[PDB]
Amino acid sequence: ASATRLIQGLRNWASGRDLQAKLQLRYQEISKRTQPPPKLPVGPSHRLSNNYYCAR
Amino acid sequence: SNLIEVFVDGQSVMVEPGTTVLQACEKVGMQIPRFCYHERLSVAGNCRMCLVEIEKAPKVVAACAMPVMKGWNILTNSEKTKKAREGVMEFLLANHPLDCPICDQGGECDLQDQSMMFGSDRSRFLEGKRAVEDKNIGPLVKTIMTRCIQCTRCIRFASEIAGVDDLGTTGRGNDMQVGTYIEKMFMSELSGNIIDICPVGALTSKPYAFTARPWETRKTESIDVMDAVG
Numbered sequence: 001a002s003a004t005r006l007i008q009g010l011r012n013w014a015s016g017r018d019l020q021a022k023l024q025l026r027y028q029e030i031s032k033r034t035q036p037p038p039k040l041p042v043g044p045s046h047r048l049s050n051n052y053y054c055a056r
Numbered sequence: 057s058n059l060i061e062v063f064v065d066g067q068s069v070m071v072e073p074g075t076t077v078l079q080a081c082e083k084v085g086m087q088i089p090r091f092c093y094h095e096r097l098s099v100a101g102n103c104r105m106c107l108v109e110i111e112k113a114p115k116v117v118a119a120c121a122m123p124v125m126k127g128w129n130i131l132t133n134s135e136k137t138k139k140a141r142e143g144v145m146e147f148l149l150a151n152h153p154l155d156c157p158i159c160d161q162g163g164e165c166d167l168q169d170q171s172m173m174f175g176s177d178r179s180r181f182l183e184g185k186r187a188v189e190d191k192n193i194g195p196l197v198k199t200i201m202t203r204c205i206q207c208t209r210c211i212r213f214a215s216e217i218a219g220v221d222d223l224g225t226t227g228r229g230n231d232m233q234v235g236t237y238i239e240k241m242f243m244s245e246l247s248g249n250i251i252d253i254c255p256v257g258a259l260t261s262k263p264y265a266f267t268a269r270p271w272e273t274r275k276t277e278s279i280d281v282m283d284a285v286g
C-alpha cells in the first residue's frame with residue numbers, strides 16, 4: 001500500500017481483481033515477536049498410580 | 057538319573073537337582089535380570105531384581121537363590137513379574153545421582169540397560185536423594201561411593217577370592233556405607249579385578265578414568281604376557 005491513486009487505478013483496471021485489499025506485502029499482521037513464554041501441557045501420561053509400563 | 061522337570065514358560069526341560077532357578081532359565085536361554093548374582097561368587101539375595109513368578113503361588117520368589125522342587129512351571133513374562141521388576145527398578149534409581157554424563161561406565165552400566173529394557177518411563181520421588189562421602193580405596197582404584205547401589209559384590213569377591221577382608225558394610229537403613237572403616241589403602245593382588253565386578257560406576261579405574269567411552273573403542277582378542285598362565 002501507501003501508493004498514489006492513479007497507479008492504483010491502473011493496477012485495478014489492468015487486472016480486474018480490486019487488487020488493493022490483497023496484494024502480498026505484509027505490513028501489520030506480522031505476528032508480534034517476543035511472545036509471552038509458554039507453559040506446555042502434559043498429555044495422557046504422568047498420572048500417578050496408574051502408569052505401569054506393562055499396560056502401555 | 058537325577059532329573060527334575062521344569063516348565064520354563066510352559067516349555068519342558070530336565071534339570072539336575074540342587075541348581076538355582078536362574079541356571080534353569082539360562083539352560084533354556086532366558087535371562088532373568090540381576091545385579092548381585094554373579095557366576096563366580098557366592099549367592100546373596102541383596103539386589104532383589106531377580107524376582108520371578110511361579111504358577112499357583114501367592115509370593116514372588118527370588119531366582120538367584122531358590123532350589124528346584126519337582127515339576128515347576130515358571131512365568132518369566134507374567135503380570136506381577138513385570139510389576140515387581142518395574143517396582144525394584146523404580147526403587148534403585150532413587151538414591152542414585154545424576155552422573156550418567158560424568159560417569160565412567162556410561163556405555164557399559166547395568167542400571168541403564170535394565171532401566172531401558174525392563175523399567176518404567178516416567179519417574180517419581182520429588183524430594184530426597186541421599187549423598188554419601190566417598191572413600192579412597194587405593195591409588196589404582198578411583199572410588200565414588202555416591203553411585204553405589206549396595207549390591208555387596210565387592211565384599212563377597214574380596215573375602216572369597218582376594219582373601220583380604222578389608223571391605224565391610226557399615227551402618228543401617230539408608231546409611232549403609234560400603235568400604236574400609238580405618239582409611240586403609242586396600243592394596244593386594246587382584247585389586248584391579250574389582251572394577252569389573254562392581255556393576256555400577258562406583259569402583260572405577262584410576263588411570264583409565266576420564267579418557268574414553270565404550271561405544272567407540274573397538275574390541276580385539278589378545279593373549280597376555282609377563283605371566284606364565286597367559
Ligand code: SF4
Pocket residue numbers: 152153154155156159160161162163165166167168203255256257258
Ligand atoms: S553407574 Fe550407571 S546409573 Fe549411575 S551414573 Fe553411572 S551410568 Fe548412570
Ligand code: SF4
Pocket residue numbers: 203204205206207208209210211234253254255256258259
Ligand atoms: S561398591 Fe559396587 S560392588 Fe560394592 S556394593 Fe556398591 S555397587 Fe556393589
Ligand code: FES
Pocket residue numbers: 090091092093100101102103104105106107118119120121
Ligand atoms: S540376584 Fe537374586 S537378589 Fe540379587
